[PDB]
């Protein structure tokens, strides 16, 4: 029967596909390791796929995967139990050491370029022709933290030029310096910009950028990781909704 031969061949095919797909999704993070960094005994039933190489544009080299794990910086965490499977608590300050929900990866310390080789992101004041076209303009507004105190004021908006979107809000602190705050982590209101993930006293600690006109992938990760970290690590300072409702 043709129909029977077909359905029979299909399952053979599907299994081959899932096998292919799965190994293909092992281009990163494998081989697995024990909680101490050494090679784990069990690597699973799927073998590592053969290497592939990406040719990166704008003279930025190439990327070959699978390959040796890129992360090598120190991780400020210590084992909690003798057996595998338990948490590893922070040995110092997780927000500063970059661990837990405040982790960051050592991405290339250069900015992301667009199709032409221009910096993808840029402060609006330096982005020819860009302006706020809809919604409340946040520039000039005071920025409030989860402790319900003012942490600064918005002095600019950093825009993604190829995609024409707001990505960061440049906030000026009391000391006259500034930090970048992720757009998807702020709430623009009519009379202020609220940042739930951070208490006023934590703004100063936000990682900074080398140049005032650009931001690197490395800096973005440090900035974003640190801000997200405040959801867990700043909880003690985060006031209730009823307090905020006042």
């Amino acid at each position: 029967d043709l129909a029977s031969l077909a359905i029979y061949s299909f399952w053979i095919f599907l299994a081959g596909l899932i096998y292919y797909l799965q190994t293909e999704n092992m281009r990163e993070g494998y081989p697995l390791e024990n909680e101490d960094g050494t090679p784990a005994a069990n690597q699973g039933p799927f073998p590592l796929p053969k290497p592939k190489t990406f040719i990166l544009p704008h003279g930025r080299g190439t990327l070959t995967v699978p390959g040796p794990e890129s992360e090598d910086r120190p991780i400020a965490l210590a084992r909690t139990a003798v057996s595998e499977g338990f948490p590893h608590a922070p040995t110092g300050d997780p927000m500063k050491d970059g661990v837990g929900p405040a982790s960051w990866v050592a991405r290339r310390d250069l900015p992301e370029l667009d199709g032409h080789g221009h910096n993808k992101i840029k402060p609006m004041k330096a982005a020819a022709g860009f302006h706020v076209s809809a919604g409340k303009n946040p520039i000039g507004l005071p920025v409030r933290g989860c402790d319900l105190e003012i942490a600064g004021k918005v002095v600019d908006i950093w825009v993604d030029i190829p995609e024409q979107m707001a990505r960061f809000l440049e906030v000026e602190l009391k000391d006259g310096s500034t930090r970048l705050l992720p757009m998807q982590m702020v709430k623009v209101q009519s009379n202020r910009v609220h940042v739930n993930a951070l208490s006023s006293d934590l703004f100063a600690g936000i990682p900074t950028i080398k140049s005032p006109t650009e931001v690197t992938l490395l800096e973005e990760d440090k900035i974003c990781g640190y801000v997200a970290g405040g959801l867990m690590y700043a909880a003690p300072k985060r006031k209730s909704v009823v307090a905020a409702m006042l």
Binding site: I55, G85, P87, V99, E163, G229
Partner: protein, 281 residues
């Protein structure tokens, strides 16, 4: 085992219940309170099902089937062999699903990401609940729910649909299908676009997002963008399920006849209901 970059993330905190009592992993799986609650519900439910198989007299996956209480039982309890077992199992599934979502929330909290995923999953749960809980209750009997059996539930689909003629005519059903089709269309486009840029012609440099935009801009005169496409996929999927629940929640509760007949309202509009000619004239 862990992924080569996992260590720094296995930090304590995030649980919604029990503090650190269940704050740990087993292999790759994280547990948490809702991790053990899910196991509890899944086990009790699978066990109760295997027992229903016995009373049925078979251990064949293609044959096993747990039916709900017969119409006669209304919305009350029933003998464990004539509906009651289905009733307990339904309670277990709901607990297992909700616990799964809540477990996802704990994981989100630990990793410091958004809660979009469990929020999305909640849509599936509400669809299941619509067929098994909300519609039966509104209709007045557990009997209207569907049976748990690989083939038996397909029989329920067929019989239920034909109870109203060709179900295709259900307006809400039409919209739900649109979303399902459009979703599959978008998923294919998005998958293909990202890959076509990451994997250009052999020997060439990896393409950029600008190339993705240009490709679709040339093709159809518009590009929703990288952020939007993900917003879109989520919207189409959820809307598809939202309209599935709606097409069912109104069937047999406020609409009882042949769905095809509902469309007569448009054909009977005053200004053209009697004009001679055409299909309906």
């Amino acid at each position: 085992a862990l992924l080569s970059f996992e260590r720094k993330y296995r930090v304590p905190g995030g649980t919604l219940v029990g503090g650190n009592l269940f704050d740990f992993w087993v292999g790759p799986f994280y547990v948490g309170f809702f991790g053990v609650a899910t196991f509890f519900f899944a086990a009790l439910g699978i066990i109760l099902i295997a027992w229903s198989a016995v009373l049925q007299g078979t251990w064949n996956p293609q044959l096993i089937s747990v039916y709900p209480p017969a119409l006669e039982y209304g919305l009350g309890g029933a003998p464990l062999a004539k509906g009651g077992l289905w009733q307990i199992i339904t309670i277990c599934a709901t607990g297992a699903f909700v616990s799964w979502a809540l477990r996802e929330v704990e994981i989100c909290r630990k990793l410091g990401i958004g809660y979009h995923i469990p929020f999305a999953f909640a849509f599936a749960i509400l669809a299941y609940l619509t067929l098994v809980l909300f519609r039966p209750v509104m209709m007045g009997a557990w009997g209207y729910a569907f049976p748990y059996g690989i083939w038996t539930h397909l029989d329920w689909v067929s019989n239920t649909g034909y109870t109203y003629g060709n179900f295709h005519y259900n307006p809400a059903h039409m919209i739900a299908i649109s979303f399902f089709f459009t979703n599959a269309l978008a998923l294919a486009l998005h998958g293909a676009l990202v890959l076509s840029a990451a994997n250009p012609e052999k020997g060439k440099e990896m393409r950029t997002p600008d190339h993705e935009d240009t490709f679709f801009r040339d093709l159809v005169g518009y590009s929703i963008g990288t952020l939007g496409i993900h917003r879109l996929g989520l919207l189409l999927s959820l809307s598809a399920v939202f309209f599935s629940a709606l097409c069912m929640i109104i069937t047999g509760t406020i609409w009882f006849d042949q769905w095809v007949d509902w469309w007569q309202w448009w054909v009977k509009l005053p200004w053209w209901a009697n004009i001679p000619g055409g299909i309906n004239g």
